[PDB]
Amino acid sequence: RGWFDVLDDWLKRDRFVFIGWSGLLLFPCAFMALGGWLTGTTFVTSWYTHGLASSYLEGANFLTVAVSSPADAFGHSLLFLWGPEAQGNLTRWFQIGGLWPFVALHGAFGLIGFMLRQFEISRLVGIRPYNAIAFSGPIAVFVSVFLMYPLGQSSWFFAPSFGVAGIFRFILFLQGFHNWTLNPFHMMGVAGILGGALLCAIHGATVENTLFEDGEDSNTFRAFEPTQAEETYSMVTANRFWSQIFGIAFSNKRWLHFFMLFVPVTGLWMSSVGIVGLALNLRAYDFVSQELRAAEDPEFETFYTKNILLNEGMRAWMAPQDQPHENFIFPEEVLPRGNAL
Amino acid sequence: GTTGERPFSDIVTSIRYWVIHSITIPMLFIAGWLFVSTGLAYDAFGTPRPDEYFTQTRQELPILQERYDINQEIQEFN
Amino acid sequence: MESVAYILVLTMALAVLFFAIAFREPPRIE
Amino acid sequence: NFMIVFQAEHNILMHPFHMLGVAGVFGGSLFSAMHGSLVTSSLVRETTEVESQNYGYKFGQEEETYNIVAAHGYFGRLIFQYASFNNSRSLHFFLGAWPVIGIWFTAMGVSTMAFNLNGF
Amino acid sequence: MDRNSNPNRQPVELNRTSLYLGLLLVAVLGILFSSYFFN
Amino acid sequence: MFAEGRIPLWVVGVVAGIGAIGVLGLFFYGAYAGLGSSM
Amino acid sequence: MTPSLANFLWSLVLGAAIVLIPATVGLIFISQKDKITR
Amino acid sequence: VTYPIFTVRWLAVHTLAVPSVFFVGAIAAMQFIQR
Amino acid sequence: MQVNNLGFIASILFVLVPTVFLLILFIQTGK
Amino acid sequence: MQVNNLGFIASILFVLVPTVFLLILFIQTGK
Amino acid sequence: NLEPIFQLTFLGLIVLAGPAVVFVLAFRGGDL
Amino acid sequence: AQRTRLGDILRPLNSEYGKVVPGWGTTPVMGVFMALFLVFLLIILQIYNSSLILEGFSVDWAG
Amino acid sequence: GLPWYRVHTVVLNDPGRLISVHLMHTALVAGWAGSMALYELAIFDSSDAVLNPMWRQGMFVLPFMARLGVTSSWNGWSVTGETGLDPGFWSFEGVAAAHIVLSGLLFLAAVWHWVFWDLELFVDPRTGESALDLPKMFGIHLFLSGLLCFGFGAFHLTGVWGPGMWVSDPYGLTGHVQPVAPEWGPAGFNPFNPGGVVAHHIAAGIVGIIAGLFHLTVRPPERLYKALRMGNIETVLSSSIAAVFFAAFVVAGTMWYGNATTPIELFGPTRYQWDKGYFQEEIQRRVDSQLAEGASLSEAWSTIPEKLAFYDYVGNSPAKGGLFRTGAMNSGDGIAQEWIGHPIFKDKEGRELEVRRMPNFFETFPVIMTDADGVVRADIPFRRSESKFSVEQTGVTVSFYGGALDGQTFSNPSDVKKFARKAQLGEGFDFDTETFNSDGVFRTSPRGWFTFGHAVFALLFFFGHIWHGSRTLFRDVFAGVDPGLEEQVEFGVFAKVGDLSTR
Ligand code: CLA
Ligand code: CLA
Ligand code: CLA
Ligand SMILES: CCCCCCCCCCCCCCCC(=O)OC[C@H](CO[C@@H]1O[C@H](CS(=O)(=O)O)[C@@H](O)[C@H](O)[C@H]1O)OC(=O)CCCCCCCCCCCCCCC
Ligand SMILES: CCCCCCCCCCCCCCCC(=O)OC[C@H](COP(=O)(O)OC[C@@H](O)CO)OC(=O)CCCCCCCCCCCCCCC
Ligand SMILES: CC1=C(/C=C/C(C)=C/C=C/C(C)=C/C=C/C=C(C)/C=C/C=C(C)/C=C/C2=C(C)CCCC2(C)C)C(C)(C)CCC1
Ligand SMILES: CC1=C(/C=C/C(C)=C/C=C/C(C)=C/C=C/C=C(C)/C=C/C=C(C)/C=C/C2=C(C)CCCC2(C)C)C(C)(C)CCC1
Ligand SMILES: CC1=C(/C=C/C(C)=C\C=CC(/C)=C/C=C/C=C(C)/C=C\C=C(C)/C=C/C2=C(C)CCCC2(C)C)C(C)(C)CCC1
Ligand SMILES: CCCCCCCCCCCCO[C@@H]1O[C@H](CO)[C@@H](O[C@H]2O[C@H](CO)[C@@H](O)[C@H](O)[C@H]2O)[C@H](O)[C@H]1O
Ligand SMILES: [Ca+2]
Ligand SMILES: [Fe+2]
């Protein structure tokens, strides 16, 4: 037995936490990313990068702590602890936002490790690897949003911060500056996510309400056995119900479950494509025909133009605080605003 | 169905686990406590204390602006 | 005249719905 | 427009019921993807490599079309054994309950922000 | 040289449900993207 | 207690649950005192 | 030989010594101790 | 009966729980910082 | 409205071409 | 050249629609 | 002062009360 | 299996189907070259990223 | 039969028809290149290489011809702005026609290989069915790649036998095609040094030749042959897709950030040059040198070429467009006619005011004027009842230096406000908006479109890689799992997951 086979045997032992070869990448990187996030949200400020308190130590709460993006001055520097910025100084590395690339890169490699784990375990137990394929969607989201978007922009500063309110800020930023809601790729993402939730709810309810009477208890949960060969709910009854209620119904179980995979995954992939577009400011910001008409016709008003006005307001009022490195000085009189407000 | 390890319920219902942990768990708790309450965390992570966000000479946000010499920048920020 | 295009695509979707309901492939137990 | 004004006036993003709605829909999509992928992954071989695997299932067939035990083995090794459902009925109840509860909470969030009890 | 029948050729199929699904997908994609095509 | 040599698991659960409730109660109290309390 | 060059090379060396080959040593050692009995 | 005490599961448990309790102690202490 | 002069052709082809692809495949099915 | 703004759509459809009619009929033939 | 001290005294006594009832019933053989 | 002149010319190139070297073969050397490639890619990335600054040039349009 | 998404799998085990479909795809791609170039030539406007260069006209393939040394037309014009040059056959038209003819020949070869699919070269002589020696094919193809890479670098790029490549000054004012010598030191890895590209092609071509020689002679280890399914062509598809999306990410990045292979005269400026005021600072430096001799303001600013000023204009940043703002940048602001000259804003008190430029992020931006020490001295107020710093109250006037408006001064607040709004966008230019019926909203450059397309394609090819790698490694269970699979998956029963020999 060669040493490689012996190692392979040890890594793939049946234990409470499977390790595998993929574990060598997953567990250290995932632990680094998680511990980095926890450390930053507990102890680390964003005073020098954003002028914000972002840790429990500073008095922030769960909703307002974040591992904030690094200072815009560094561009897309990877900000290694040993890099030319921190130069091995851990305190300075924390202060310049070095924890953000730490978490982002370790999380990217952890995600790779987790999907490799899906592949490895699928191969070991002898099933098709569709779980890894489904997980490609979250990977596309993470790559586009946390890497490609800031890479197309001026710096990592404009990446989403790892935090609840940081993410909320990123969301509102994308609305105001990119008109992200108007983006058809985002609308396909929304369709996929809401459709996935709908499919989850409707399938769970349909199964639970077409169950066969296989026990005597009012508690129907123990009238199932994992090794039983027969279906536990009536597909025929479900199909008739949905055909008469909704007009159409699934008749193929396999197609049903592939659809439940397909819808949210495609939603994630389409939204990731849209985010890639936004990385280069290739926005679906305006409808030029309506802009031109409004510019020449002061009685043409649509919900689109109203939303454009909202975006202008958000940008002007938010930019000085959101982008402190720019030293934006917008005097009170240049701020757009409606009457009396 | 057990992969070999001792069941959690058995371990955490046993006297020896609790003899060990009625000590170990509180010690880490008060170790983190002391980490905060001695001011070690402030100095280790560079997080400002409530009275050090601004200095008697810097009333503005100490936003970093220089690409490579941040140690000196932070020092002049105080 | 882009109104015509919008109406056209919407009508296409609705016609697909009616045919998918009325002229569906019948589920058959076999 | 409705959503933007709503956020401006109520801070719905910082409302815990809307956070529960987001958990509802994100988690519902997550569980839809997992369930579909685990069932598709554990399909019993009934077709050839040419035809769609969907033809391996016949409408109204009594037998099970996938191996739930293999799906449980895979998932309980992906995370750990006791986090994996092996009872299809409990699994499907969870699939129904998660998005429904999340959406109930977010509906109540909007309904209570209707009375200007706003987000944090 | 001789022209010999290729034994790797296979029929393609699209069942009626697949047709309805594809037609709906095409119709809704057109609905979605037409406004942006017109701009 | 009811059995010698081991703690009942429900007692352990009650004790750990009360500890967790106290931790979350301390955090909610701190939302209103000290740093981050707006005062 | 710049300071950043020295730090990159040091990063290679310390990455090896801190992660790559205490982990390989530990994995090999344990796999050869706890060996699967066929 | 007579299981090993230390395992991969033991390490996985502690790798999380130990810093977790440390951090919780830190945050508890933060609850008493005054400006 | 001054819309893109390629909008009608783009939208119509965007719908039409996949439509005839599906129609061809469906109608020939069972041959 | 100032040509009829419906020329491209008219010509393209004039060719395309009978083309797909023939294509459908030919491809399904023998079903 | 002492208000949190007394408050926590009452709160802890109340908190223990229910579990005390369950524990006493379980140990003494009562119906549960 | 129609024969052509160019087919016969090319025949020995497509004749070794499935022949392998038993065991691990050259895999260690492959691994060494892969590690060197990774270090090279790291070097050029960090140079492009300005996280590795060498003397003699600047990552700038001016050179 | 086959579902629609699996139709092409019929050439999976048919090497002759796989070659056929590859030939047809190659013919389609080459024909696209030729016809794209022909269309661009049919609409290209070569009259003004300064203010209407290729990248303002939505020219996508023309810069790629020009990058490698094809810079002249049969109509006498050259993209370097020169005329009367004789390229020979290898003009834009010649290259496009060559691609069209290549497309035809490839189409015919594809037809031949489709019809005569059953060549005995494809059949395993040991047994008798179709088989490809994939490792040996890799050795052959890699050796060829190394030869062609080395030849490209050492002969074309060096000018030993070939045109060289496009090189330019750092400010994109004197771009042209010349031979480039390789740089063998560390500077060869500076992405903005073309000698690095030359030396890369020589060295990597040599390495590819050596590696192909190794792969023509040494057979795969049995371990690797089994692990990577080297008898399965889908493993090649998987790893090829991986390498391809790697390359696509790289080319997208080098296009977005700029480098020696993406010069601004061919693809336009980058967003980062606008971000950092690269051209603005160079312009100011030239003006300051002129002044330091003793030139007046008007003379010093008149020394500034219109091309550099045109680079210093936000409408030429690739980060200003829209996903559905289609076509050339000339369809946006119009065709640039001339530089208006540099405005200098003075308020009533003589303070010199700087208009804050619009960042790449902002679709709209407030007009703000600051003095030397960064204090707002004038603006354009939104609300006027509490206005304090308006152009009207502060008496701001603008005088122009160089360009069309040289020597003129404006005091009418309407004109001052108009020119302040122009100055927000950088250097000001007169535009022909009639030719394109330009709409007034910015477009992105070919740099932006290329980066977008290739970033998206790379992202999708990641999924392609995952799909085909999974199909390669899980080929045995593609049609479903074994109708047994009972106790192999159960927990704790075996010592190693799946390994039936363990417990
Ligand atoms: C002799 C044949 C020939 C010649 C001289 C040309 C010449 C040209 N072509 Mg063309 N082409 C050809 C055949 C040819 N082509 C064929 C057969 C096709 C069909 C696939 C095309 C399709 C095509 C398109 C779509 C385009 C061109 C374009 C061009 C022009 C610019 C090319 C360029 O940028 O290079 C770019 C090439 C590369 C960057 C090669 C990348 C290869 C990667 C990096 C290597 C892969 C990894 C490697 C194998 C592994 C490592 C090995 C290593 C160690 C050695 C140029 C005039 C462009 C143009 O200007 O349009 C008119 C254009 O867009 N061609
Ligand atoms: C990556 C390849 C590439 C790139 C970077 C470019 C770039 C460019 N081209 Mg071009 N072109 C290409 C390939 C490319 N082209 C090909 C293959 C053709 C043959 C059709 C053409 C033919 C062409 C013409 C005729 C013209 C250009 C022009 C241009 C310029 C204007 C760009 C523009 O507005 O497009 C707009 C892009 C969009 C509006 C984005 C469309 C996004 C679609 C709708 C996505 C589809 C969604 C999908 C259905 C979702 C799936 C659903 C899901 C369930 C899977 C620009 C520099 C113009 C120019 O100025 O020439 C001088 C012009 O006249 N090109
Ligand atoms: C070199 C690249 C490459 C090659 C040679 C293949 C080859 C193959 N793929 Mg694959 N794939 C790729 C990349 C590639 N893929 C990428 C990047 C993705 C992620 C999007 C995928 C995702 C994928 C899936 C999910 C599947 C395949 C399948 C297949 C097999 C059947 C193909 C078929 O009949 O569909 C026929 C396609 C049609 C009839 C219509 C397609 C219409 C598309 C959506 C629009 C076309 C746009 C335009 C014309 C394409 C040019 C764009 C170009 C610049 C890329 C075949 C061997 C199937 C398989 O595995 O079979 C068992 C399968 O299920 N692929
Ligand atoms: C934090 C995460 C860290 C992850 C750590 C992962 C643990 C290590 C996994 C290593 C797996 C890769 C090697 C696979 C085994 C193998 O190839 O053959 C095993 C061989 C065959 O030997 C002998 O050969 C005999 C004959 S033969 O192999 O059949 O030829 C055979 O019988 C016998 O079994 C065998 O002993 O044994 C070896 O000793 C060769 C080791 C070479 C390994 C590659 C080295 C590359 C890594 C170094 C990186 C730095 C390089 C310098 C850069 C500046
Ligand atoms: C009150 C009752 C009256 C009904 C009115 C509402 C109509 C809803 C009927 C759904 C139409 C079917 C479309 C799929 C075409 C069709 O007939 O599919 C039929 C299909 C049946 O699948 P099977 O199980 O038979 O599939 C087995 C294999 O043949 C797979 O091809 O149902 C589904 O696939 C469910 C998933 C799609 C669900 C799509 C719903 C979309 C909602 C409508 C969105 C468009 C609105 C646009 C407005 C402008
Ligand atoms: C940073 C860094 C690092 C790392 C580190 C680490 C990795 C660590 C860690 C760490 C950790 C890992 C920590 C932790 C934690 C934790 C916490 C802080 C917790 C919590 C919690 C809570 C609060 C919960 C609560 C609850 C709920 C809510 C539900 C039910 C009940 C309970 C109680 C459970 C190093 C040094 C390498 C390098 C440098 C950088
Ligand atoms: C036969 C022959 C010939 C001829 C040839 C020719 C004439 C050709 C051509 C060709 C061509 C002329 C071509 C082409 C092409 C094109 C293509 C291939 C394309 C495309 C497309 C696509 C794919 C696109 C897509 C899209 C869309 C649609 C939208 C946007 C996005 C995208 C881009 C995706 C000769 C006599 C010479 C020789 C003999 C033989
Ligand atoms: C859920 C859960 C858990 C936990 C639990 C806990 C943690 C707790 C609890 C509980 C408690 C901790 C309780 C309690 C109670 C108490 C009560 C219910 C009482 C009372 C009474 C009263 C009514 C009072 C009265 C009074 C007045 C009125 C005034 C005078 C004095 C006095 C104070 C006597 C376990 C793990 C087990 C199981 C699973 C989950
Ligand atoms: C999977 C791989 C993971 C890679 C990451 C793993 C952790 C890697 C951490 C590497 C840290 C590099 O840390 C770096 O160490 C070197 C060498 O001591 C320090 O260098 C220090 O000592 C050396 C000599 O002793 C002096 O020449 C130098 O001037 C001084 O700074 C750097 O200041 C520090 O930045
Ligand atoms: Ca007033
Ligand atoms: Fe199900």
Q: Are residues M235 and M339 in the same domain?
A: no
Burial class (CB in 10 A: 0-12, 13-18, 19+), M174: exposed
Distance of CA A121 to the CA centre of its chain: 24
Rounded to whole angstroms, the Cα distance separating H23 from A56 reads 11
Alpha helices in M116-232 (DSSP H): 134-151, 194-215, 222-227
Buried b (16+ CB within 10 A) or exposed e, D58-92: bbebeebbbbbbbbbbbbbbbebbeebbbbbbebb
Backbone torsions φ then ψ of L57, nearest 5 degrees: -160, 165
Residue M423 and residue M345: Cα distance in Å, rounded? Answer: 10
Q: Are residues M49 and M125 in the same domain?
A: yes
Residue M123 · residue M164 · CB < 8 Å: no
| Tokens 């039983």 sit on residue | A228
Q: If you write DSSP's letter for every residue of A7-51 in order, what string do you get? A: HHHHHTB--SS--TTTHHHHHHHHHHHHHHHHHHHHH--BTTTTS
Q: CB-based contact (8 Å) between M495 and chain G?
A: yes
Nearest residue in G to L55, CA atom: G2
What is the domain extent for residue M394?
Answer: 271-443
Interior angle at CA K12, CA K11 and CA K13, nearest 5: 95
Q: What is the DSSP string of M48-95?
A: -TTTS-GGGTT-SSHHHHHHTT--B-TTS-BTTS--S----S-SHHHH
Contacts for B38 with CB less than 8 Å, ≥ 6 apart: none
Quote the longest CA-to-CA distance of chain H.
Answer: 55
Q: Is K19 in the pocket of ligand 8 (CB under 6 A)?
A: yes
Extract the tokens encoding M471: 């199909």
Q: Give chains near I: 3+ CB pairs under 8 A.
A: A, C, E, J, M
The distance in angstroms from the start CA to the end CA of chain I is 48
Cα dihedral A64, A65, A69, A71, rounded to 10, equals 90
**Which of M443, M466, M489 marks a domain boundary?**
M443
By Cβ distance, the residue of M321, M383, M495 closest to A337 is M383
Beta-carbon contacts of A15 under 8 Å, excluding residues fewer than 6 positions away, are B3, B4, B5, H7, H8, H9
CB-based burial label for M344 (10 Å; 0-12, 13-18, 19+): middle
Beta bridge partners of A283: M322
F14 lines ligand 8 (CB under 6 A): yes
Q: Give yes or no for a contact between H23 and A38, defined as CB atoms under 8 angstroms apart.
A: yes
Which ranges of M397-497 would DSSP assign to H, the alpha helix?
A: 413-424, 446-473
Interatomic CA distance for residues H34 and F35, integer angstroms: 6
Number of domains in chain M: 2
D63 φ/ψ angles, rounded to the nearest 5 degrees: -70, 160
Contacts for L31 with CB less than 8 Å, ≥ 6 apart: none
How many A from CA of M237 to the centre of ligand 3?
11
Tokens, residue J16: 């395309």
Q: M429 has which bridge partners?
A: M339
Query: CB count, 10 Å around CB of A230?
Result: 11
Experiment type? cryo-EM
* G contacts of L50 (beta carbons < 8 Å): none
| Nearest one of M364, M334, M327 to M448, comparing CA atoms | M327
Say if residue M37 is in the same domain as residue M78: yes
Inter-chain touch M496–G37, beta carbons under 8 Å? no
| Cβ-proximal residues to M27 (8 Å cutoff; 6+ apart), any chain | M102, M103, M104, M105, M106, M107, M110
Alpha carbon distance D34, D44 (integer Å): 18
Regarding whether M214 and M95 lie in a shared domain, the answer is: yes
Q: Are A49 and A157 in contact (CB under 8 A)?
A: yes
What is the DSSP code string of L22-61? Answer: STTTTHHHHHHHHHHHHHHHHHHHHHHTTSS--TT--SST
Q: What are phi and psi of A98, to 5 degrees?
A: -60, -20
Nearest of A211, A202, A208 to residue A259 by alpha carbon = A202
Output the six-digit token pair for F25. 């109660």
F17's tokens = 């649950």
User: How many domains does the structure of chain B reveal?
Assistant: 1
A252 interfaces chain C, CB cutoff of 8 Å: no
Nearest to B31 by CA among M98, A153, M13, H21: H21
Nearest to M206 by CA among M260, M165, M248, M152: M152
User: Sign (positive/negative) of CA torsion M291, M294, M297, M300?
Assistant: negative
Instruction: Check if the beta carbon of residue M153 is closer than 8 Å to that of residue M201.
Output: yes
Cα of M326 vs centre of ligand 2, distance in Å, is 8
CA distance A58 to A63: 13
Ligand at minimal distance from the CA of M387 is: 10
Resolution (A): 2.0
CB contact under 8 A, L51 and A80: yes
Q: What total number of domains does chain A contain?
A: 1
Residue that is written with structure tokens 């967790």 in the block: F20
How many alpha carbons fall within 13 Å on the CB side of residue B9?
7
- Co-location of M14 and M38 in the same domain: yes
Provide DSSP, A155-193: SGGGSPPEEHHHHHHHHHHIIIII-GGG-HHHHHHHHHH
- Specify whether the CB–CB gap between A226 and D61 falls below 8 A: no
State whether M266 and M298 are in the same domain: no
CB burial of M478-501 (b: ≥16 within 10 Å; e: otherwise) equals ebbbeeebeebbebeebbbbbbee
CATH number of the domain that B43 lies in?
1.20.5.860
Q: Which amino acid is at A238?
A: A
Ligand 1 pocket residue status of M208, Cβ below 6 Å: yes
Residues near ligand 9 with C-beta < 6 Å?
A: A 81-82, 88; G 6-7, 10-11, 14-15, 18-19
Total count of residues recorded for chain D: 120
Distance from CA of A2 to the nearest CA of H (A): 23
Give Cβ neighbours of residue K5 (< 8 Å, ≥ 6 apart): none
Last residue of one domain, picked from the residues M443, M458, M486 = M443
CA C15 to chain centre: 3
Could you tell me the residue range of the domain that residue A70 belongs to?
A: 1-341
How far, in Å, CA of M173 to CA of M176, rounded?
10
Question: Is residue B1 in a domain?
Answer: no
How many Cβ atoms are within 10 Å of A337's Cβ, its own excluded?
12
Q: Is M87 in the pocket of ligand 7 (CB under 6 A)?
A: no
Instruction: Please list, in sequence order, all residues whose beta carbon lies within 8 angstroms of the beta carbon of residue A228, skipping any fewer than 6 positions away.
Output: D64
Q: What is the rounded end-to-end Cα distance, in angstroms, of chain L?
A: 59
Closest by Cα among D35, D75, D92, D67 to A226: D67
Q: Is residue D18 part of an annotated ligand binding site?
A: yes
Let me know how long chain H is: 35
The CA-based dihedral angle spanning residues A77, A79, A82, A85, taken in that order and rounded to the nearest 10 degrees: 70
User: Which of F1, F2, F14 lies at the smallest CB-CB distance from K19?
Assistant: F14
- CB-based contact A116:A22 (threshold 8 Å): yes
Residues in chain G, overall count: 38
Which residue, L21, A312, A292, is CA-closest to M226?
L21
